[PDB]
Amino acid sequence: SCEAVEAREIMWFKTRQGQIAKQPCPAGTIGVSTYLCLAPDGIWDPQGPDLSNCSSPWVNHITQKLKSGETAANIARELAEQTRNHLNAGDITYSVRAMDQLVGLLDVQLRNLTPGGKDSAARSLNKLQKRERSCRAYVQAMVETVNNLLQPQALNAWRDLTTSDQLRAATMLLHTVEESAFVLADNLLKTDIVRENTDNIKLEVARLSTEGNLEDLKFPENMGHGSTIQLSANTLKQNGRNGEIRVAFVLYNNLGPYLSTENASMKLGTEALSTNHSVIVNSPVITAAINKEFSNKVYLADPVVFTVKHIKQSEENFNPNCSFWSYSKRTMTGYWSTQGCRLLTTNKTHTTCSCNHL
């Protein structure tokens, strides 16, 4: 009563009462696909098969490369070269996971490349230059790997991934890129600024100094014509450590929707007049992190303002409410919170919000 064949080369048994049944993913992948009738009565699970495991064969080649123990910059370059083609939830999850191991390997090589003797002529300088060059290479490749992954036409794989895993994988994207940013900041030579940006992801890692009088920091300067985040000169001095502050701003286009509206703390009002009211992240995700702090609620001396633009600008979105994504590093699962953030002004094109934390 519950057997059928799907377009992705997957047939099924007839489970007289919704019994488990799986068949391999279509020729060209390595995963499988389960699909049993929702009710024991005998009705196809309308959700269809879960193509959440199938992944392109490039996964295996990179896996052995991670084993070969080569410099992670080369592996990161190779990953982007493959992610140009059609993407899969398995490829997404594999790249997300890979971007976590490469950091560990880099950490190992950074620990290894440490002065271990008298600097005869330029040994320490050569080690530092090699590190900075390789680390700049890693983050430059990371902006490319995320450019490829957040391709607008690649949302089909993101939707295939279950709601629970799609927010978790996206949360890990936010976590691995900020780790890479802070690593780049820690390996900058003399308080310089690095800005590797692309159509989807824009990144600015800048190691600044708290000496004398300092200026404010704004990202992006004028690119994006909107969605601009800004800190204050006083905040820089507050989060200063021994005349050094590692700052990292990032703007993500085409990632917001993948983040689910779990436990959203929007404050609604009289405008709520829909029996089937829905919520939508109608704004590009802007992000800022300071002094190697992931999620510890660091309070700011002066507020942080972000004029995030509207994805869909018409009069069908009754009211706005600014939010922030809080996630537990251990579970990599998070939720939208309006805590410490208050709407300033709103209109059709943009919306400025004031938060107390970064």
Epitope: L214, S232, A233, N234, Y299, L300, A301, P303, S354
Partner: antibody
């Protein structure tokens, strides 16, 4: 909205005093606090400041260390403790306020002040 | 950062113009506010960021900025406006002030 400040009088040099500033009509947990003094026949001079959410303190180099500003939002009162007072501090101290939430607009604009506390050193 | 406020004295006539400048030693993008301290009273906010006057302040005043010399113009000295005007850098700590000009017919 009131910012009455008290705690003045004669204090022998190198003594210790404690300023009070009761704020009514608004909460100091979400509003800044600023101390600006005015020496006899001189100009307004910045003394200290506290962020109401971070407790970030910053004193003018003139009063570094010797002065420690406190913000007890519990009693809706601000305090400027004045340890090791020097004869260069004799002035009228005013506790001013600026709305933290709206900082970018009206940047550090002291909307409301107070009558003032006069302290003398002899 | 340090500023200067010249002239420190004037007797602008009732209805005529006052122009108090403010030499800014270092390039500070706007972020300068003029305060008015009525003799024996508390300084009030007049202009914020050398651009627009604060809600409630007579529209007679007007803040302008040339990039380095911030200026204030009282369109006409209504005789209830003779006091000491100041020039404060409101960009970052330290919140330094100026010498002070005195409009005294």
């Amino acid at each position: 909205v009131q910012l009455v400040e008290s705690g003045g009088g004669l204090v022998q040099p190198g003594g210790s005093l404690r300023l009070s500033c009761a704020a009514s009509g608004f909460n100091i947990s979400s509003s800044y606090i600023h101390w600006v003094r005015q020496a006899p026949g001189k100009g307004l001079e910045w003394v200290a400041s506290i962020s109401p959410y971070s407790g970030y303190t910053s004193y003018a180099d003139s009063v570094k260390g010797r002065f420690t500003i406190s913000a007890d939002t519990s009693k809706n009162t601000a305090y400027l403790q004045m340890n090791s007072l020097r004869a260069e501090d004799t002035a009228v101290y005013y506790c001013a306020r600026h709305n933290y939430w709206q900082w970018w607009e009206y940047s550090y604009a002291l909307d409301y002040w107070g009558q003032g506390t006069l302290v003398t050193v002899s | 950062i340090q500023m200067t406020q010249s002239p420190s004295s004037l007797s602008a006539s009732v209805g005529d113009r006052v122009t108090i400048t403010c030499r800014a030693s270092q390039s500070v993008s706007s972020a300068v506010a003029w305060y008015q301290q009525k003799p024996g009273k508390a300084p009030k906010l007049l202009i914020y960021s050398a651009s627009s006057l604060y809600s409630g302040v007579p529209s007679r005043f007007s803040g302008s900025r040339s990039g380095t010399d911030f200026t204030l113009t009282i369109s006409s000295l209504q005789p209830e406006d003779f006091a000491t005007y100041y020039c404060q850098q409101s960009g970052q700590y330290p919140l330094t002030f100026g010498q002070g000009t005195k409009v005294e017919i």
